[PDB]
Amino acid sequence: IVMTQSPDSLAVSLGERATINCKSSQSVLSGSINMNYLAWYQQKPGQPPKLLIYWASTRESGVPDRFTGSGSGTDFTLTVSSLQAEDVAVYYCQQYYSTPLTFGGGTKVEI
Amino acid sequence: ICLGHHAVSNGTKVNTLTERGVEVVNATETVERTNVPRICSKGKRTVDLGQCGLLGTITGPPQCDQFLEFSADLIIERREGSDVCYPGKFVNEEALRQILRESGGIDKETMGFTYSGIRTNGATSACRRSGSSFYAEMKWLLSNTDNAAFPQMTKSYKNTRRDPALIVWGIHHSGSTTEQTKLYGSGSKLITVGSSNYQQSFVPSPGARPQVNGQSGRIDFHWLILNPNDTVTFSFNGAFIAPDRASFLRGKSMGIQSGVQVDANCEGDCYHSGGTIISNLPFQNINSRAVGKCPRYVKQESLMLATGMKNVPE
Amino acid sequence: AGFIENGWEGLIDGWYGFRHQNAQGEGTAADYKSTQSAIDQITGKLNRLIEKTNQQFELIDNEFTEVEKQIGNVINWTRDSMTEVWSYNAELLVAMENQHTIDLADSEMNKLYERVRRQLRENAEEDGTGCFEIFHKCDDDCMASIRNNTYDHSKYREEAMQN
Amino acid sequence: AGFIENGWEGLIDGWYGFRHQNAQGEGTAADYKSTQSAIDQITGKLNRLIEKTNQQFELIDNEFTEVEKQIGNVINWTRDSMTEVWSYNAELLVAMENQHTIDLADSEMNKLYERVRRQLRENAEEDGTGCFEIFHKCDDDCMASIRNNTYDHSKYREEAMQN
Ligand SMILES: *[C@@H]1O[C@H](CO)[C@@H](O)[C@H](O)[C@H]1NC(C)=O
Ligand SMILES: *[C@@H]1O[C@H](CO)[C@@H](O)[C@H](O)[C@H]1NC(C)=O
Ligand SMILES: *[C@@H]1O[C@H](CO)[C@@H](O)[C@H](O)[C@H]1NC(C)=O
Ligand SMILES: *[C@@H]1O[C@H](CO)[C@@H](O)[C@H](O)[C@H]1NC(C)=O
């Protein structure tokens, strides 16, 4: 299983839509749970990559509401409604339906 | 000329206001008797709980490992499905079951309940995977190492989400007072649970019980619903089963309690213990407890709606 | 369908038909308008009846772990009363719609009968068994003209008044 | 209302009426007895239908502070089942009384039609379009006598049998 990602760093300003796309070689959905296994991580420079959302739709406690994850069988999306200086990081989509965990290629966001 | 109508040798006997059992040239079914003995529900998300119980997905016995934070528009319960590994019972059980059946699956969001001065890795021989263990999201809060005073602890969790959280916890009534002192220490333990709409409190009551699942003590599994921007406070002196992850609703589902295997071969609408009632007919005589948008129950075995005329043989 | 001795068995395509037994021979044809109207009305009644419910019901009672006995009997009694009133409504509706279907068949039948009366001023009259005694002879043309609802009576009046 | 090609649009005051097309000219009149009976029957049906109920229900569920979830869901399910049965009964009642009012209008038309044919033994006959072909000449007195149910057919038989 290979984990692709979106195009390279986006030259987006503050307070606008930010879209990151993730695509999978296989299907990471269901398993009699219908819960589409996919994690999203943001990584600040010099800080460990803290998780954003888990199973691509469950927003974590310690993250803002602006991070919205849209999921499907193969395609996945992170959308940011109003990006600011606290959201600059590099983003990874990780599959964990199958045992060889492959992270995403990294999607840096640029102000 | 001679003017007349049509008739057949073998028609159908139908019920009528004036006479009962009148002979008609053709008639149609009204009450649906044909039952599909399968939960065929294609086009809808479906989880088959199996050996797992609906409440167990909230609390996490070993049989409910697979469906701990599921998400589906059709929740299927089984009679073999058990809700607990360690023996116990949920208070206000059917209210929680009906909340779970209309949840669209559940999510688990961590409480951040750090604990100092106590041992939190509860271990029971009944709730077994690789040794003496406990539930998925429950910490059985024991003493430090042996008989010792459990410190009075106040832990507050604030539901910062925009949806009402489903808070759950447990109360351990030991098999004896000596066992209660072994696990939590001496003294009369008293636990209060405070919220804006929840003020119920209680005292654990050690005592001898029949050996259910190889254990004597029982866990009363209490629960509440937290509104958005609301905090719950657990003030426990001892004998507590603290939650780890608060449960959160997802959306709208429709939960069934069936006993047949699941497939995806029908655009089914309502389901019951006997299977699925696929029909456009207005009435059915299969099960009185079918839930969903489908034909409705009647007492008559079979109703004949007259489609043709009053035929008379030639 | 009351004054008729029996219904025809050879009438297959149409619900309401016609027989001639004239000098040309014997023929059994089928009317189209009356049976089309009757089937349209009855199929519309069925399509009104054949309709799955929109209202969504959830599980209120647990089959495996029995609920508290007082609220359990309350649920059982409410469901039993609803089942009884639904069985009542179903049998009442089935009885009265079978009655209305039989009455609609009779109404279409004697509507065709009375329109055949209206098409035949005095060239024909009833026998009481559902047959019309034609007082003129045609080579199976006026048979279809009665059937096609394109019958002219004024040209057949002069030879049927004196008989 | 079956054999009529189309209902009249110029008739306003009543429900059932008459057209003249006689030698005096063309005129439209309105019958009074049949429309009075039809409106009386339909208004009685409305009066027995348009009635606020005597039974006075009480507030069983709380809108502001939600009641206990088990008994609350029992109340919700009972109210949903009663809503479904009341909606079904309302559709049933509306459909069957609309059918009965349509059949009542058809039967009032039929009763007026048969009473007009009963008034005029052989002086007039139907054509199939809802009209009557008068076989005698009379300047609006005979026709108003037909409307007034005072028609004396005995003095018109001699000139209508030969025609
Ligand atoms: C008789 O009614 C049934 C409805 O159950 C229908 O399927 C069938 O086509 C009908 N047959 C005829 C000859 O009308
Ligand atoms: C609770 O807090 C959230 C965000 O902190 C806020 O949007 C919400 O209005 C608060 N609740 C009330 C009742 O004010
Ligand atoms: C309620 O009715 C169901 C059948 O629909 C039956 O199985 C159950 O035993 C009944 N409950 C009681 C308490 O009798
Ligand atoms: C019961 O129905 C009312 C409206 O009829 C609705 O507002 C309420 O939420 C329902 N209760 C439950 C528990 O769904």
Automatic annotation (TrEMBL), chain B:
It is found in: Host apical cell membrane; Virion membrane. Keywords: Clathrin- and caveolin-independent endocytosis of virus by host, Clathrin-mediated endocytosis of virus by host, Disulfide bond, Fusion of virus membrane with host endosomal membrane, Fusion of virus membrane with host membrane, Glycoprotein, Hemagglutinin, Host cell membrane, Host membrane, Host-virus interaction, Lipoprotein, Membrane, Palmitate, Signal, Transmembrane, Transmembrane helix, Viral attachment to host cell, Viral envelope protein, Viral penetration into host cytoplasm, Virion, Virus endocytosis by host, Virus entry into host cell. Coiled coil: none annotated. Palmitoylated. GO terms for biological process: clathrin-dependent endocytosis of virus by host cell; fusion of virus membrane with host endosome membrane; fusion of virus membrane with host plasma membrane; viral budding from plasma membrane; virion attachment to host cell. GO terms for molecular function: host cell surface receptor binding. The keyword Cell inner membrane does not apply. Its main location: host cell. Disulfide bonds join C52-C64, C270-C294. One of its GO terms (cellular component) is membrane. It is a single-pass type I membrane protein. Binds to sialic acid-containing receptors on the cell surface, bringing about the attachment of the virus particle to the cell. This attachment induces virion internalization either through clathrin-dependent endocytosis or through clathrin- and caveolin-independent pathway. Plays a major role in the determination of host range restriction and virulence. Class I viral fusion protein. Responsible for penetration of the virus into the cell cytoplasm by mediating the fusion of the membrane of the endocytosed virus particle with the endosomal membrane. Binds to sialic acid-containing receptors on the cell surface, bringing about the attachment of the virus particle to the cell. This attachment induces virion internalization of about two third of the virus particles through clathrin-dependent endocytosis and about one third through a clathrin- and caveolin-independent pathway. Plays a major role in the determination of host range restriction and virulence. Class I viral fusion protein. Belongs to the influenza viruses hemagglutinin family. Homotrimer of disulfide-linked HA1-HA2. This is Hemagglutinin. The chain holds residues 21 to 334 of 560 of the full protein.
TrEMBL record, chains C, D:
Coiled coil: none annotated. It is found in: Host apical cell membrane; Virion membrane. Disulfide bonds join C138-C142. Palmitoylated. In natural infection, inactive HA is matured into HA1 and HA2 outside the cell by one or more trypsin-like, arginine-specific endoprotease secreted by the bronchial epithelial cells. One identified protease that may be involved in this process is secreted in lungs by club cells. Belongs to the influenza viruses hemagglutinin family. Binds to sialic acid-containing receptors on the cell surface, bringing about the attachment of the virus particle to the cell. This attachment induces virion internalization either through clathrin-dependent endocytosis or through clathrin- and caveolin-independent pathway. Plays a major role in the determination of host range restriction and virulence. Class I viral fusion protein. Responsible for penetration of the virus into the cell cytoplasm by mediating the fusion of the membrane of the endocytosed virus particle with the endosomal membrane. Binds to sialic acid-containing receptors on the cell surface, bringing about the attachment of the virus particle to the cell. This attachment induces virion internalization of about two third of the virus particles through clathrin-dependent endocytosis and about one third through a clathrin- and caveolin-independent pathway. Plays a major role in the determination of host range restriction and virulence. Class I viral fusion protein. Homotrimer of disulfide-linked HA1-HA2. This is Hemagglutinin. It comes from Influenza A virus. The gene is HA. The chain holds residues 346 to 508 of 560 of the full protein.
